[PDB]
Every structure is written in C-alpha cells, then in structure tokens.
Amino acid sequence: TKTVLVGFDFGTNKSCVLAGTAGATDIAISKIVPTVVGYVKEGIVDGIVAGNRSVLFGDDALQNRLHARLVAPMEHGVIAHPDAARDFVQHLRSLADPSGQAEIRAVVGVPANATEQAREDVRRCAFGIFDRILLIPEPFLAALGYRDDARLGQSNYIDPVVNSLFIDIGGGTSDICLVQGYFPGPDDQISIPFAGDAIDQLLQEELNRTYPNNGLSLHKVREIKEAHGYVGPSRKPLDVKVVIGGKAHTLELGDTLARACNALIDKIYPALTTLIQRASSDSVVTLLQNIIITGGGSQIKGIDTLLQKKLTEDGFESPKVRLAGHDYKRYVALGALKAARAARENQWQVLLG
Amino acid sequence: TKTVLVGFDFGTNKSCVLAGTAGATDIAISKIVPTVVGYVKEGIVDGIVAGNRSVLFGDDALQNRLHARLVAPMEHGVIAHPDAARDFVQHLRSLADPSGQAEIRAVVGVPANATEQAREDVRRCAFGIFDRILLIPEPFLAALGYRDDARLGQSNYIDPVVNSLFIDIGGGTSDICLVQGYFPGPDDQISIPFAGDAIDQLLQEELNRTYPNNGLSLHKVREIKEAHGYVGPSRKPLDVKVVIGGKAHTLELGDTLARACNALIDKIYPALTTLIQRASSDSVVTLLQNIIITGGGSQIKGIDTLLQKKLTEDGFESPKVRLAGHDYKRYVALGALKAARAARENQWQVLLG
Amino acid sequence: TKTVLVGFDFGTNKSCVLAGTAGATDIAISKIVPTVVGYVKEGIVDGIVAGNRSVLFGDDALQNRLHARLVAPMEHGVIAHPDAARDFVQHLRSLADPSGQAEIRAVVGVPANATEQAREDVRRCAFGIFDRILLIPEPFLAALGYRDDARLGQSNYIDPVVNSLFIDIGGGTSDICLVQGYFPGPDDQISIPFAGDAIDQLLQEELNRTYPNNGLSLHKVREIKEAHGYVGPSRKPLDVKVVIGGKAHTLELGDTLARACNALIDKIYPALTTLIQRASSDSVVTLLQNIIITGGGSQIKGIDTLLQKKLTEDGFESPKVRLAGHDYKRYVALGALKAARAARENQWQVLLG
Amino acid sequence: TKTVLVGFDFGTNKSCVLAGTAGATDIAISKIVPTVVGYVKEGIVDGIVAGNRSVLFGDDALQNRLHARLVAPMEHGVIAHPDAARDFVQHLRSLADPSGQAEIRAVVGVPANATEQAREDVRRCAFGIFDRILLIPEPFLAALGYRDDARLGQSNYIDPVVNSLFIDIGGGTSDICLVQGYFPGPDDQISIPFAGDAIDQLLQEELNRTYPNNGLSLHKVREIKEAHGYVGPSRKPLDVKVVIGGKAHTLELGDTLARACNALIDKIYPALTTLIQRASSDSVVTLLQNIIITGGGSQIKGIDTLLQKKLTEDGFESPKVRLAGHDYKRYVALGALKAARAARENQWQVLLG
Ligand SMILES: Nc1ncnc2c1ncn2[C@@H]1O[C@H](COP(=O)(O)OP(=O)(O)OP(=O)(O)O)[C@@H](O)[C@H]1O
Ligand SMILES: Nc1ncnc2c1ncn2[C@@H]1O[C@H](COP(=O)(O)OP(=O)(O)OP(=O)(O)O)[C@@H](O)[C@H]1O
Ligand SMILES: Nc1ncnc2c1ncn2[C@@H]1O[C@H](COP(=O)(O)OP(=O)(O)OP(=O)(O)O)[C@@H](O)[C@H]1O
Ligand SMILES: Nc1ncnc2c1ncn2[C@@H]1O[C@H](COP(=O)(O)OP(=O)(O)OP(=O)(O)O)[C@@H](O)[C@H]1O
Ligand SMILES: [Ca+2]
Ligand SMILES: [Ca+2]
Ligand SMILES: [Ca+2]
Ligand SMILES: [Ca+2]
C-alpha cells in the first residue's frame, strides 16, 4: 500500500486537512472544513438533506443547520465531544484519503501547552483513523507553514521560524509561542482558552443583557464579530443590521464590540509580554521585530496596530507586530504537513487500543 | 549478649543481607529482599494483606503492589527516601536477627565513590539498627564475595582480588573498580549513576514516545528489559508481548531495547577505559585478562562479548571480559560478610546520635 | 443505651437494612423493603388498609397501591423526594431497631460518584434517625458484602475485593467500580444513571409508541422486563401476555425488550472499558478474570455472556464476566454492615442540624 | 524629595509595614494589615461599603467579607495571586507613605529558602511601588527585630542574634533559621510550607469528615484553632461553641485540635533537629539555650514546653525553647526596618521593568 502524510489542523472553529505523499513537496489534498458535526434531526423528511445522509460535516452541516443538531467537536482547542470528534476525524480521513486504503500518517496540531489528557483525547479520536500520529503545538505549526520554503536562503526574506513570536489567536485558544528555530519547550509557549469563541460568548452576554431574548444564534453573533468586531478605542456609531424575532433591527454595537474584542487583548497581552521577557536577551531585540499574529483572530480589525502600540508604550525596544497573511487557515495544516514529511521514522506515534 | 556480623548489600533494586557469628565461616542468615517498601494504602480492607500489616517489605510489597504505595528506598545507589530506607533497614535487621537481641555489626556496601553525605545517609538510617557500621565500596565487596576462599592458594584458581577489574553494573549505579589486592583508593574506582534503572527510564521514554499512554508500569518495562534487553547490534524483529489497556499487544522493540541497553555501554566504557589506563603498566596486561562484570547488569544478553569486542578493537592487549556468575546478587553481601569477619576492632564505626 | 450498627443499602428499587451489635458477626435484623412510600389516598374507607395506617412502606405500599399514592423516595440512586425519603428511612430505622431506643450507626450506600449534594441529601434524611452515618459507594459495598469472610485465606477462594471490577447494575444507577483492596478513589468508579428504571422507561416509550394508551403501569412494564427482558440478539417470537384495557392481549415484544435492555449494555460498556483501561497494567490481566456483575441488573437474561463476548471481541486478554449470585439484594447491605463493624471511631460522621 | 525606608513583612496571614526616615531610629508608620484583598462583589448597593470602595484591604476587607470576594495574596509564604498581591502592596505603600511622593526603599521579608521565582514574584509585585527592594529571610528579620538595640552591650541581656535558633512558625511557612550573628546561608535555614494555614486545612478536613456540610468558613476554623488549638497530649473534653447552619452547636474538638496542631510539631521537628545538628559543636550548647519561637504559631498553647520536652527527651544538652513575646507580628517588620537603615547603598536592588 501507499503512505499518505496528512498535516491536520484540528481547530475549534475550522479544521484544515492537507494530504501528500512522501518525498514530493506538492499537496495532493487541501480541504478547509468547519469543525462542526450535524446529526440530522429525528423525523427528517426524505430529500431535505441531499443524499439522505444522517451525519453532515463542515459546510454541509452549516447549510443544513436547520434540519440538523450541530455539535462542535472541539472547545478551547481541545476535544470536548469524543463521539462527534471521532465522526469528524473519520470524515476528514476520507477527505484526505478518498480511496480509503492508504496508510495515513497525520501530524495533528494541539494547543500550545496541551495537557496529556487533551493529547490522549486526540490520539483516541484518531485510533483506527490515522495509523501514525504526531502531536505538535499549533503555533509552532503556524510558524512552520507560514515559512516559505521556496524563498529560504534568500537575504530579502526573513525566516518566521529562526526567531519570532507567533500569536496564533484561534477560535478556541490563543496560543503565543517563542518560535526560535527548534521545537518549542513547555516554557516557550502559553495557551489562553480565550479567543474567538470567548469573544462570541462575551457578545452573546452583552446582547442578551441589553437586547433580551434577541434569539441571535452563536453563528450570527459570530458573524457580527467577524464583520464589525474591532480592538482598540470604541467606534461610535457602529450600526449592525440584525434580525431579531423576524423583524429587521439596527443595533448600536460600538461599545459592545469594543468591550468584547478588547478582552482578548487584555487576556493575551499578559502572556505576550511574559514570553517577550522569557526570551534570551541576545535575541529579544529581533523577536520584537518579528512578532506575528496568525489564526482567525489575526483578522480582527486593528489588532496588529493595537498590539504594537501597547508593546511600544510599555517600553519594548521597537516592536513590530505583523499579521500572518490571507492564508491563516492553512498555516497550521501546512506546518503539520511540513513536519510530517520531515518527521523521522522514530518520531511517529503508534495508535494501539 | 551475642554479636552478629551482617554483610549488607543495600541495593537500588535488591538488597541482600547475610548474617553470621564471629570466628566461624558458615552463613546463618542469607536473604535477598527487593529494595522496596510498600505502605499499605489508606482504606485497605481487612484480610487483603496477610496479617493486616501496614508496611510491606520486598516481595511482600511487590505481590501487594496493587494495595500498597511502593517507594524505592534507594535511587542511584544512594538513599533517596530516608524514612522508607530506615523502615527497610529495620526490616532487614529483624531478618538478619530474628531474636532482635543480638548486637549487629554490619558492613554496608556503598557505591564506588559515595560522597560523605551519601555515606552519612546510610549511617543515619542505620543508627539504632546496626550497633557498628563499616562502609566499603560495592564493587570491592563484589570482588571479595566472588572470591572463593575454599579455592585460594591453588594454582588453577585465579584470584579475582589479586588483580582484576570489576564492573558492578547494578540497578542504580554501574561502579567500575580496580581491585588490586587492597582497599581501593578514590582513584581506583569510578561510579556512574547509569545502570538498570537508567535503562528502564530510557525504555519508558522510548515507549511513551512511540506507544503513548501505554500504561506500562516501570515494573513491567523492567521485565521487558530483563527478558529481551540486549547490547550490541539491533536484533529485528524482536516481538515483545505486552498488555496495553487491558488488551494484549505485540510490540516490536528490537531497536528500542538496542538503544536502551547500548546507552549503558556508551556510559560505562569511557570509565572502563579510564581505569584500564589508570592501572600500573606492570599489571594492566593481567588486568585486561581479569575483567569481571557483576551485578544485575552482568545478565544483559551479550554484554561481556560486546565489552571484550570494544576493548579488543581499541587495541588493548588481549582483554578477557568475564561474567561474575549466577550468584551476582549475593556477591556484595558475601564480600561484606567476609569484610565484617576480617574487620579489626578499630575499623568498626560507632553510630551515635 | 446500646449501639446498633446498620448496613443500609438505600436503593432506587429496593432498600436492604441490616442491623447487628458491635463485636459480634451475626446479623440481628435483615429486611429487604422495596423503596416506595404509599401515602393512603384521601377518603379511604376504614378497614381497606390493615390497621388504618395512613403511610405504607415497601410491600405494604405495593399491595395497597390501588388505595395509596405511591412515591419512590429514590431516583437515579439519589434522593429525589426528601419527605418520602425521610418517612422511608424512619420506617427502616424502626425495622432495624424495633425497640426504638438504641443508638443507630448506619453505613448508607451511595452511588459510585455521588455528588456532595446527593450525599447531603442522604445525611439530611437521616438526621434524627441515624446517630452516626457513613457514606460509602454502593459497588464497593457490594464487593465487600459479596466477599465471604468465612472462606478468606483459603487458596480455592478468590477474593472479590483483592482485585476485581464490580458492575453494580441497580435500578437507578449502574455503577462500575475498580475494587482493588482499598476504598475506591473517585477515578476508580463511574456511575451511569441508566439502569433498571431507564430500561423500564424505554419499554414504556416503545409500548406507548406501538400500543398507544395501553395503560400498562410502570410496575407492570417492569415485570415484563424482569420476566422476559434480555440483552443480546433479538429473540422472536417472544409473546408477552398483558392486560390492556381489561382485555388479555398477547404482544410480541422480542425486538422491544431487545432494544430496551441492549441500551443498558450500550451505556455501561463505554464506562466498563474505561475502568478496564484505567487499571494498572500489572493487575488488569487479573481484573479481566474477576469481572463481577451485581445488583438487580445482574439478573438480566444473558448479560454476563454478552459482556464477556463484547470484551473478548474488543481484544481484552481473556475476560471472565461473572454474576454476583442469588443474594444480589443484600450484598450492598452486607458490605455496609461489614464496613460498620470495621469503621473506626473517627470514621463515623455526626449528623447535626 | 525624601527617602522612606520601609521594613515590610509580607505575610500569608498578616503583613506588617513599618516606615521611617534615614539616620533616625524612631518609627514613623507602623501598620499591621491582614494579608487579604476583598474585591467588592458585583451589584453592591451604594452605602454598603463605606466610601463605595471597590477594593478593600486588611480589616476593611475582613469586616466586609460578606460583600467582597476575599483573595489572600500570599500562600505558603510566597505570592500566589500576583494581581491581588500588587493591589495589596500598592495599598501598603500608601500606608507607609501617605503623601505618595517619597522614594520608598523597602526591605521585604521572604521565607527562609525562598526560590528565585518566589523572590522575583515579590520584586515583580513591587515594581513601580518600591523604588529599591531588598529581600531577606523572614526568620533572620524576626531575629533582628526581636533584638533590643536599646539593651545591647549590657551583660544581663542575651542577644537573640549572636547565637540562636529561630522557629518562625507563621501562617504559611514555618521557617527555622540558625541566626549566628551574620546573614544566614542557604544551609542555616529550612522552610516548611506547613504552618497556621496547614493546621487550618487539617481542622477543616477533620470537621468536614466528622461534621459534614458544617459550613464553617476557614476564617472560623482559624478562630477555633487560635482560641482552643494546642500541641501536646489530647485535652478532653474540649467543648468548642460553633454555629452550624444557623443553629448553635457545641462540638468536642479535643482530639481534633490535638491532631491538627501536633502535625505542625511533627513537621517542624525534623527540621528543628536538622539545624540543631548543623550548628558548630562549639556553639550548639548555647544554641540549645537560645531557641526562640516567633510568628503566629508561637502563640499555640504549650508549643515551647512541648518542643523543649521533645528536645530534652532526644538527648540534646539542656535545651531552652523560648517564645518571642507579645510583639510577634512586628518582629519581621522591625528587623526589616533595622536592616533597611543598615543596608549599604550597593545592597539595594533596583526594580526595572
Ligand atoms: N475578521 C474577523 N474578525 C474577528 N474574528 C474573526 C475574523 N475572522 C475569523 N474570526 C474568528 O476566528 C475564529 C477562527 O480562528 P482561526 O480559523 O484563525 O483558527 P482556529 O482553527 O479556530 O484555531 P484553533 O485551532 O485554536 O481552533 C472564529 O471563531 C472567528 O470567530
Ligand atoms: N537478565 C537481565 N537483563 C537485563 N537487566 C537485568 C537482568 N537481570 C537484572 N537486571 C537489572 O539489574 C538491576 C539490579 O540488579 P543487581 O542486583 O545486579 O544490581 P543492584 O545491586 O540492585 O544495583 P545497585 O548495587 O546499584 O543498587 C535491576 O534493576 C534489573 O533491571
Ligand atoms: N430478572 C431481571 N431482569 C431484568 N431486570 C431485573 C431483574 N430483576 C431485577 N431487575 C431490575 O433491577 C432493579 C433493582 O436493582 P437492584 O435491586 O439490583 O439494585 P437497586 O437497589 O435498584 O440499586 P440502585 O438503587 O443503585 O439502582 C429493578 O428496578 C428491576 O427492574
Ligand atoms: N493563639 C494562636 N494559636 C494558634 N494559632 C495562632 C494563634 N495566633 C495566631 N495563630 C496563627 O498564626 C498565623 C499567623 O502567623 P504570624 O502572624 O505569626 O506570621 P505570618 O506573617 O502569618 O507568617 P508568614 O510570614 O509565613 O505568612 C495565623 O494563620 C493563625 O492561624
Ligand atoms: Ca488554529
Ligand atoms: Ca549491588
Ligand atoms: Ca443497589
Ligand atoms: Ca511572618
């Protein structure tokens, strides 16, 4: 049979699976599936769900979220629902391996400091799916996939892995990591369970507190944040057109979005400065010049400017906070695929049980 | 009152206690008790442990390791847990003295270059237990106990004490010693804290790295090494039948045991050659012909052949590495008993305070 | 006053009270009273209930269930109706102490992982009834009462407490517990609120869904399950003679009972294997040989064979699932009485308030 | 500007701040604030807390512990909550400096062998508060503050610093120190994280084990120990009047307080005798005559007599265990102020960040 190395980014909001053979460098499969499993509701009529499938994954479960009970397999970057997570990894295996006969060797991205229970949860929802697994911190894989191997060696290209600080603000955890060329130790990374889902929850609370029984689902309170959420000083007026009870209302969520998204900064800044002061004095001056924000939370309006302003005001020697880029979804999966093709035979973990 | 001279081999894995009267040469008591103390767990049901004992020693603590919290009194050939060590020495005193009224004079075996703190640790967990103590290095006691006094003087018997090199590869330390007829000086012996427990730890790491959350206890990772561990070139395939999570699996640990046990050789060979080149040039040609491996580590499959091969390949004049024999457990205790019966009245150390 | 140690198995379906003096080993009082309180209905004619009692307990409330409103004090192994539970414990106190003057010291059996609120519920409906209380998990007490103290020490008697796995499938909870010689920790036991009452509810739903308005009470849907309920493959045809609307009908409930009782296996097997894989690898090979099912749910037709089959096909090393025996009702009460006579003076909890 | 030298005793139960100018010997500010920070709860009605303060410190937080969430900044003599500790040191700075404009130079008392992390926790919660810091072990500062400089030189006054052994039994740690005239080395002191809060925890466990759901807060289980706690043989009957569930009960806590308080002796005695045997033989005969107990734990009923009895029974040459005195709270702050006024310009540590 053939072996398929799979860079797997098991996220709280969206997972991304990449599949390629050994020796080569191209990417056979590259899918970005929202981490959600929809169990088609009991009593569903035939023809409502295309193919009468009883379990939907990703967008197929988000479009049919009216007919399906949605369950997010992952919460705070760790597996919260083992059965849904197993179903979802089983779906993504068929995605990364359409034939279903190849031996999958997956490097799955775990949070920065994932507890051994949170790692056995991933090694248990991957048994019988992935033949060999390898659990690497998510921000290190983000640094490894953001790195342009085609542009290495050049002088006009600064390596994001040689000396940088990666602030992978996902949708479950916000992992900061001191990526200093090698596999980061337990002290080179800090994971805060406050990210996109926490800002969604804060907006849900500040909406059910001022506009009670609004009925706005978390999937819409998330779109409000993705479209209008911002960090920094309040922006008023900021009219958000919502649908509350069938009727179209226009809420004023300037202060609401400001307080919801600035809590993320207030959470990740004490851990940003902690790792900045944990770095070696010889290398921190360039570490400040190479601070990179990845993950979905990098798309928050004005987060790099606010973080660089807060690091400059605190006296850090000329920080330069940078955004990862447009491909913030595949960075952890690209890094996990690069770490799969570079993993030694003795590095892969055997999944028995 | 009567005096009982006790040859005590306080080991990291097994301690062997011998007891005999003065003047005679027979051996009254001879016990080999695994150095372990199991404190019966809180809430134990009556009748689970025979006699409702709350502290179990040796095999009684290994058979009842499910109901008892086991603590190893000794780590790296030095007392690591003083309370468990004192409990264990108190048990072995009752073993060497069932009446409990005789004055015990014990020669305890310490590592090759045991620090004065590591020796006061043994003289402190023996106060009130042994009336007089005498601390002699463990490999010299192994040389003394391996020596056959019934076969001395004969021409067809080579004395292991007259001029030999003893590599007592224990379970905590691997002490190499130039046994040249007399009490070895501090430069005639080298102690490396790498032995059976270090190979057990290396196997535990190599198993939790490839077969994560295997749950194999150290007492089973140790039996794997005793049954299949080997030094030399890798032997594949070498199937080890284990029980991981209730289910019976068959792991492939050829390279694993190879890398685990060859680290012991890589550790003890720089100290083997150091003392071979420290010996007098007049006597080193005979030293190489009398290289003897004792301790549990002598039972590793193919360790004398590997060490003789490494010593011949390095150009040493015809080395002949030999195993101690089947009685590798009592050799330090036999030597300590022979050193107790030959100790002058001024050699015994008084334990006060 | 005299002290009476009372082993109390407060069950969801039946509670077993045992009473004995201190120091002795005989059992003075031993009653099995169905956990139910029948409050005699308003307007009851004199002479309908023997003695004109207004509150009936156990069988006296089951025979007079036409004249009394029955309330089950316990649901899911925890006290659900505090007033009925206090009345019922007050009745069982008079059962264990007919004189009503002795100081009762009761060891009540709680579920495996009973929350502190579920324990204060039992310590609150026992205040003024039991002078000292002691709450121990129900499966551990089943292990302690199944143990035959007359045959301890013998070689031909395997101890159910030294190392075993007890599946106390009651009528409210199904508690699995790693009984390994000592008081089980919070991780050695899992309690699932799915047992006899859950299968009763599943049968009630599957009967009100196919045979609507059948009028079969839960007390008859329960007898259907006790008489014909089975786990494993469906058995058709399986005719159950019932009385629906006064008329005698003969339903076909092969698939119905199959699906109702196999849900219990589907619920308790993920928690069975969880503790099988939680046990130490040194003792799991014996744990699988000593898997014991107690409680009412042990009487389900073919549950030990089915669970042994499911554990064998999953690769567990030669499991051997055994049934507790005929005396499955007194095992928790016998164990609580053995734990009362062996409880230290500082183990008894004082009930004030 | 003016400089204010501040002897700061940052305790687990009570922190004492002393402030004085340079050159003089009088004490400008002397406050004893219980180390607690009460964050006023959300939704507090105006007028409940005097001044509508949102953060209360010391007694102001203990009197309003019903309206405020109390957090102890310090646990085991080290800073456990950095934010509450920073607020608390900020309050104590305003206490030692009402004007808030003077340059504060604080000598803060750390435990005996405070780890460098536990010292950077104090230098980090003091940055921007104290301009210069100096961390000295707490028992040495207690020895320095117990010293009567007004009585030095006299013949009828034995100096507590020239040669003594201080058992500062605080509320977080119980530090024993060989105070032999100079700054004690790392081997002249032992810190045990078992003191007042550990006895409070032991009493809480022994009360929730015998009188379950008693609801007695730690602040009341602490007053029980302060009013009735004793070391030595059990004192029965010892009736303690408590309030359990609104109702006034009278518990018997003779054995309870005995076992709770004698654990402190059993913990601090192996470290007491360790330093007694670490002292020079020339000075140990005087050291035993000058054994002094300070800190809150010195107020335990019969602790000096019990420790002197235990030291005499062990054969130590005529020990004389003495209590510090009534002013056991300001001794560490008095010594820290005496060491601030005697600290050289190069001894002060600059706090930058
Ligand atoms: N433009 C935006 N503004 C604000 N938030 C956004 C934006 N785009 C995405 N997000 C948030 O980012 C989250 C997704 O994060 P991302 O996809 O970067 O990493 P992730 O895979 O979710 O991280 P993890 O692996 O920790 O789950 C979503 O929950 C979403 O709420
Ligand atoms: N056949 C074998 N193969 C490999 N290792 C073995 C074998 N037999 C014993 N050992 C190892 O030897 C170790 C101890 O045996 P031995 O009695 O020779 O040393 P020891 O006296 O316990 O050690 P020390 O003197 O350092 O305390 C054990 O930990 C065990 O792992
Ligand atoms: N032969 C049988 N077949 C199927 N179910 C049975 C049988 N006998 C009893 N049961 C069920 O077992 C339940 C009683 O369980 P048991 O008496 O073993 O413990 P319990 O007191 O219910 O414990 P708990 O209160 O923790 O549930 C009853 O509800 C009944 O439905
Ligand atoms: N009379 C008493 N009996 C018993 N314990 C007491 C008594 N008085 C005070 N305590 C205990 O002493 C503790 C306070 O110790 P003290 O004030 O002597 O030093 P501390 O500053 O708290 O110690 P640290 O500096 O280690 O925090 C309190 O927790 C209290 O429980
Ligand atoms: Ca991510
Ligand atoms: Ca040895
Ligand atoms: Ca039961
Ligand atoms: Ca103090």
Author numbering:
A (entry chain F), B (entry chain C), C (entry chain B), D (entry chain J): 34 to 386
Give passages from the manuscript.
We identified a family of actin homologs, most closely related to MamK (25 to 30% sequence identity) but present in non-magnetotacic bacteria, and therefore presumably with a distinct function. Sequence analysis confirms that it possesses the conserved residues for ATP binding and hydrolysis, and structure prediction confirmed that it likely adopts an actin-like fold. 2d classification suggested that it adopts a rail tracks-like architecture, consisting of two strands rotating on their individual axis (Inset). This prompted us to name this family the Bacterial elongated entwined Rail-like protein (BeeR).
We next used cryo-EM to determine the structure of the BeeR filament, to 3.1 Å resolution. This revealed that it adopts a three-stranded, parallel, right-handed, staggered filament architecture. The diameter of this filament, at ~80 Å, is significantly larger than most other actin-like proteins, and it includes a ~25 Å-wide cavity at its core, responsible for its rail track-like appearance by negative-stain EM. The longitudinal interface along strands is largely similar to other actin-like filaments, with domains Ib and IIb making extensive contacts with domains IIa of the subunit above. The cross-strand contacts in the BeeR filament are distinct to that of other actin-like filaments. Each protomer interacts with two consecutive subunits of the adjacent strand, as shown on Fig. 2C. Contacts with the top subunit are minimal, with an interface area of ~35 Å2, and consist of a hydrogen bond network between Arg 157 of one subunit and Thr 307 and Gln 310 in the adjacent subunit. In contrast, the contact with the bottom subunit is extensive, forming a contact surface area of ~ 450 Å2, and consists of multiple hydrogen bonds, between Glu 149/Glu 153 and Asn 246 and between Arg 242/Arg 252 and Asn 380.
